[PDB]
């Protein structure tokens, strides 16, 4: 009689190449603004979009946003593969069909 | 600094197994292959052969291979270590059980060395293909172009990213141990190695001995000519039966760990751009099948992906919002409308 | 035993014919290929070369080859005999005129040893296609899987299923015999031969003779030297001029006749069934292009047969009558509905 | 006769250049490949390697080759020169920098000799297709058939149809000149050749000398180690730097000029003709894709042509004006109807 056994273990290549499932929320947007007003002719400010945060780089202080459009190109489910982003609908954890 | 891998070099021994297509049939070659990892991009393949080439018997001759012939190992030259596919391959590096080589695409992979009086080849059926990294589905690494972050197996060997277990091997039969003592069968030992022994007739039932004789059975074909020889452990291959005692230590690092290197990819010839009134005409001639993507900058993307092989002329309605296109692996370019 | 094949072993002679692609152009190679028979299943090829393999001049052997250079059979040890296709092959066995080899798919077959100072190879245009036995259009015999009644050529040689003709050789021409003695042309015979003398000058035109000389004619280029060597016999090849006499008998048995053996066939991955109301959703993940056949079990057969290669999901309307489907080489199965 | 082309023989000397895929990586092989010329009909290839094949040092040894090993050359035999593609090729003639061979179709071309202790091969991504003469899309030259006016490279070399410029090569760096004079970097000379020389630090600024020593700099990786050695000229390769002094003349003839030869072309099996009222029915059983064309002889040509691969039966409405058709490369036929 032969007692043969086998189990599935993730490949060694998983350390470098591997897809990443992601569920995303609304989040908060940021912007880099340059203001060359008056005679100062320069600014290099990183700012948010929430309608409360002041940004007081150099001498002037200002507030930005919120955005008029809540448009998010990302879907609720997002799959990231190394460098490119795909809005593929990964099913859920622990439920993947074989071969798919 | 190649002497810091003695766990692979000394604790492991050459190994033999069922090659599915050894020569004209399924013999038991000393270089039976298993777990070929053809998942890189630059055409490189990692092959785990049963034979364990590396240093010589004691500590030297990196340029020598050591396979097992019969009861014993034999360290010889590596003169004609051949790896083949639909087209002949080219060796790159070898270490322990694993040999790193690059092959053209093909349906089967073959490995064969040369003892000198013997061929000793082995092969297996396994799909091999290599799509280059990028949008230009070429088929051979080009002379020039642009570089991209490909996936390729490390050229080096002194890495410990992953490990492979080497336990004690399981007993191998060899009926040539069963010499004849004029009217009875007489087992003899390789070096005092353990010989699990017994026959279908009732006689000595364990066998942990020097050279014994058989009192009861007479025909060698009904006797256990086994060798437990775990003085040098082996990899837990699927072609070797298991040692009932225990899985010994000997956790061995994978020689060639895949890493995210930067291969050189091809670059398609630049398209000939012709402008019309509110429409973009792309006069282009692809050298190899390349996909081009277009994406409107307005609210509606209206994307279009299309691999093209023959020279073709395409058009695009460039709206006031604007249009952008990516021909091959060239950097993306955008465009206006009046 | 081996020596029980004297009819082909003793009487046959390695002949030389006009290989179509002998190296650069069509020379007269001693290994002129004839009657390539790639009609088996698993990819085994039978080639009827013009050289006589196996037997040394000295009765019989197997580690030797007899090929004809010049007027004499310069037999040697067979040492590096190639059998090539789109990729190099691996020969199985060789017997006299015929040599059985296993090849990968390709469109050309080339044969050649390399005697060392010279190559003496030969090729011929003939497509070779290998359909594996079964429902799966595979490429190479896999390690495992089910077995099916294939048909192929036996490696055995001691068979007499079929015979081939072998008669007296024709009048081989040899210009090197027309030497001159500074006054008239001199004919020569090596041993036991009986050459024919013919010349353009008005003279004795018949000239059948042992060692002798011309009557009057002097211009070597105005003569013919035909050689007679009726002591041995050659195969009835279509590239060799017929002897003007009788069809000498002697049936050379064909060493490798087709037989009904059992080849290992591939085994497609099991489909993933998913039941649905009066509908059979079938998930398929083929490894190689495999046939899929299904048929209704009711009064109307409603057949459906289509090759599937890329993984896809197909569905069928399983009525209360029942439905049957045969995926790959798996045994057929049946289904109901509620 | 063969020594009547000394313009190339003595005046030119092979050099080393940057092979795209030398061995396993981008090394600097002495057999660097340039200008693969796959334009012949019968699959014949011309390759221009940077190594000089042909005569020995002065005028002899057609069976020898000369490559450049570091700063000096060493002519050896042609023992194991091999040009290879998807399948191994068959060399026809070698002369100067050029090699003529007949290769199977394939995507990559490799050239490699065998020095005996090392391979020293090179390969470049460059597809080579087969274009059968005529209208019958075969894959290898058949042994018979009707011949056609193909275009093909000639095996002859004593031709003066075309020339290629052979200027003084650019200078080459050789860091092995830069030995150490116990504390300073020190430069020798090959034979009194011109050693252009200077370092980052201020020292001897031209270098037209015998073996100099450095006064200022210390590191061998901060000096110019060059050899102007235009006592022997080199091809105007795009992989070598060009000496700014001047561009020498000395153009030598191209070995293998294309010629309008006559290749054998395949002949498709003849059709089985069958007919009905004013209706030709045509039975076709092609072995390889062959173009069929038809043409009505009336006022309206009404042409029709299609590549046919699978066996098929077609029809044609034959009017009293008559109908012509040209299956394969068989002479055209024509007909009337009742
Ligand atoms: C799909 C499309 O608009 N294609 C058009 C093509 O048919 C036309 O020939 C060309 C101008 O010649 O503009 C292009
Ligand atoms: C799960 C499922 O509905 N599968 C197939 C569907 O893809 C196909 O379009 C339809 C008609 O053939 O049969 C359905
Ligand atoms: C019987 C006859 O006239 N035969 C040829 C027929 O086999 C073919 O199917 C048809 C296609 O148009 O042309 C018809």
SS3 readout for B205-242: CCCCCCCCECCCCCCHHHECCEEECCCCECCCCCCCCE
Which secondary structure element, helix H or strand E, spans residue A30, and what is its range? strand A30-33
d(CA B308, CA B288): 8
Is there a contact between D139 and C107 if contact means CB atoms under 8 Å apart?
yes
Token pair 């042994």 is at which residue?
D143
CB atoms within 10 A of CB B61: 16
Q: How many CA atoms lie within 13 A of B157 on its CB side?
A: 22
The torsion angles phi and psi of B6, rounded to 5 degrees, stand at -70, -20
Is there a contact between B151 and A83 if contact means CB atoms under 8 Å apart?
no
CA distance from start to end of chain B: 66
Closest A-chain CA to B35: A11
Closest D-chain CA to B105: D86
- Mutate which: B42, B87, B147, B286, vs D, most D CBs within 10 A: B87
Burial class (CB in 10 A: 0-12, 13-18, 19+), B190: middle
Is there a contact between C140 and B125 if contact means CB atoms under 8 Å apart?
yes
Q: Are B323 and B335 in contact (CB under 8 A)?
A: yes
d(CA A12, CA B44): 16
Tokens of C335: 């289904």
Give me the residue from A13, A15, A83 closest to B39, CB to CB: A13
Closest C-alpha to C227, from C249, C204, C207:
C207
Q: Are C172 and C200 in contact (CB under 8 A)?
A: no
Closest B-chain CA to C140: B125
Residues 6+ away with beta carbon under 8 Å from A22: A77, A78, A79, A80
Is there a contact between B142 and D20 if contact means CB atoms under 8 Å apart?
yes
- Provide DSSP, B110-127: EEE---SS---EEEEEEE
Distances B280 to B284, C302, D22 between C-alpha atoms, Å: 12, 51, 43
Tokens of B85: 């596919």
d(CA D336, CA D275): 12
CA D128 to chain C, closest CA, distance in angstroms equals 15
Q: How many CA atoms lie within 13 A of C11 on its CB side?
A: 18
**Alpha-helix runs per DSSP H in chain B:** 6-9
Burial class (CB in 10 A: 0-12, 13-18, 19+), A54: exposed
d(CA B229, CA B109): 31
Ligand nearest to the CA of B304: 1
Residues 6+ away with beta carbon under 8 Å from C129: C38, C105
Q: Are D113 and D65 in contact (CB under 8 A)?
A: yes
Give me the residue from D24, D84, D86 closest to B92, CB to CB: D24
Tokens of D45: 């290839």
Read off the DSSP letter of residue C79.
-
Handedness of CA C86, D26, D31, D169 (dihedral sign): positive
Q: How far is the CA of D150 from the centre of ligand 2 (A)?
A: 53
d(CA D295, CA D304): 7
Read off the DSSP letter of residue C285.
-
Asked whether at least 3 C-beta pairs link C and B within 8 Å, the reply is yes
Ligand 3 pocket member D281 (CB < 6 A): yes
Ligand 1 pocket member B281 (CB < 6 A): yes
d(CA D15, CA D30): 7
C38, C39, C41, C44 alpha-carbon torsion, rounded to 10°: -30
Give the residue whose CA is nearest to atom 9 of ligand 1.
Answer: B313
Q: Is the peptide bond before A66 cis (omega within 30 degrees of 0)?
A: yes
Closest C-alpha to B132, from B267, B304, B306, B332:
B267
Distances D138 to D133, D142, D192 between C-alpha atoms, Å: 9, 9, 58
Q: Are D211 and D189 in contact (CB under 8 A)?
A: yes
> What is the CA angle D20-D21-D27, rounded to 5?
80
d(CA C187, CA B200): 77
Handedness of CA C325, C327, C330, C335 (dihedral sign): negative
Read off the DSSP letter of residue A55.
B
Q: Are D40 and D29 in contact (CB under 8 A)?
A: no
Burial class (CB in 10 A: 0-12, 13-18, 19+), C265: buried
Q: Are B31 and B112 in contact (CB under 8 A)?
A: yes
CB-based contact (8 Å) between C80 and chain B?
Answer: no
Which secondary structure element, helix H or strand E, spans residue D15, and what is its range? none
Tokens of B75: 């360290």
Residues 6+ away with beta carbon under 8 Å from C6: none
The torsion angles phi and psi of D179, rounded to 5 degrees, stand at -65, 180
Residues 6+ away with beta carbon under 8 Å from D276: none
- Provide DSSP, C292-335: EEEEESSSS---EEEEE-S--EEEE---TT-EEEEETTSPPEEE
Q: Are D159 and C144 in contact (CB under 8 A)?
A: no
* Rg (alpha carbons) of chain B, rounded to whole number: 29
Model resolution, angstroms: 4.6
Q: Are D283 and D273 in contact (CB under 8 A)?
A: yes
Ligand 2 pocket member C317 (CB < 6 A): no
Tokens of B79: 């003169």
d(CA D39, CA D256): 12
Ligand nearest to the CA of B316: 1
Is there a contact between C285 and A99 if contact means CB atoms under 8 Å apart?
yes
- Provide DSSP, D153-188: E-S-----S-EE--PPPPPEE-GGGEEE-SSSEEE-
Residues of D in contact with C83 (CB under 8 A): none
Is there a contact between B258 and A83 if contact means CB atoms under 8 Å apart?
no
Q: Partners of B166 in the beta sheet?
A: none
Ligand 1 pocket member B27 (CB < 6 A): no
Read off the DSSP letter of residue D96.
E
* Rg (alpha carbons) of chain D, rounded to whole number: 29
> Solving technique for this entry?
cryo-EM
Phi-psi region of D182 (alpha: psi -120 to 50; beta: other; left: phi over 0): left
Residues of D in contact with B92 (CB under 8 A): 24
Q: How remote is the C-alpha of B90 from its chain's centroid?
A: 13
Q: Are B161 and B9 in contact (CB under 8 A)?
A: no
């Amino acid at each position: 009689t032969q007692m043969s056994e086998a189990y599935v273990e993730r490949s060694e290549e998983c350390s470098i190449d591997h897809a990443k499932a992601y569920k995303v929320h609304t989040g908060t947007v940021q912007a880099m603004v340059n203001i060359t007003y008056g005679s100062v002719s320069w600014r290099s400010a990183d700012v948010y979009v929430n309608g409360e945060t002041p940004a007081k780089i150099g001498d002037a202080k200002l507030i930005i946003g919120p955005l008029s459009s809540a448009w998010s190109p990302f879907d609720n489910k997002v799959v990231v593969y190394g460098h490119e982003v795909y809005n593929y609908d990964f099913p859920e954890y622990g439920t993947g069909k074989a071969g798919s | 600094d190649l002497d810091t891998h003695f766990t692979q070099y000394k604790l492991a021994r050459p190994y033999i197994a069922d090659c599915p297509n050894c020569g004209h049939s399924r013999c038991d070659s000393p270089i039976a292959i298993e777990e070929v990892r053809g998942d890189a991009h630059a055409g490189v393949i990692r092959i785990q052969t049963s034979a364990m080439f590396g240093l010589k018997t004691d500590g030297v001759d990196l340029a020598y291979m050591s396979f097992m012939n019969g009861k014993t190992q034999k360290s010889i030259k590596i003169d004609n270590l051949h790896v083949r596919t639909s087209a002949p391959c080219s060796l790159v590096s070898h270490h322990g059980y694993y040999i790193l080589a690059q092959c053209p695409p093909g349906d089967t992979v073959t490995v064969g060395f040369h003892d000198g009086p013997n061929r000793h080849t082995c092969t297996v059926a396994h799909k091999v293909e290599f799509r280059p990294v990028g949008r230009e589905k070429y088929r051979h690494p080009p002379e020039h172009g642009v570089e991209l972050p490909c996936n390729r197996y490390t050229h080096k060997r002194a890495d410990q990213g992953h490990y492979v277990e080497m336990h004690q091997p399981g007993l191998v039969a060899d009926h040539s141990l069963l010499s004849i003592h004029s009217a009875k069968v007489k087992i003899t030992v390789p070096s005092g190695a353990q010989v699990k022994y017994y026959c279908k007739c009732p006689d000595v039932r364990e066998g942990i001995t020097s050279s014994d004789h058989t009192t009861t059975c007479t025909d060698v074909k009904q006797c256990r000519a086994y060798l437990i020889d775990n003085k040098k452990w082996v990899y837990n291959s699927g072609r070797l039966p298991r040692g009932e005692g225990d899985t010994f230590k000997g956790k061995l690092h994978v020689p060639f760990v895949p890493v995210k290197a930067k291969c050189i990819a091809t670059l398609a010839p630049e398209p000939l751009v012709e402008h019309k009134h509110r429409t973009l005409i792309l006069h282009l001639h692809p050298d190899h099948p390349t996909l081009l993507t277009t994406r409107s900058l307005g609210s509606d993307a209206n994307p279009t992906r299309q691999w093209i092989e023959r020279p073709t002329t395409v058009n695009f309605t460039v709206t006031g919002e604007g249009l952008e296109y990516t021909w091959g692996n060239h950097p993306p370019k955008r465009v206006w409308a009046q």
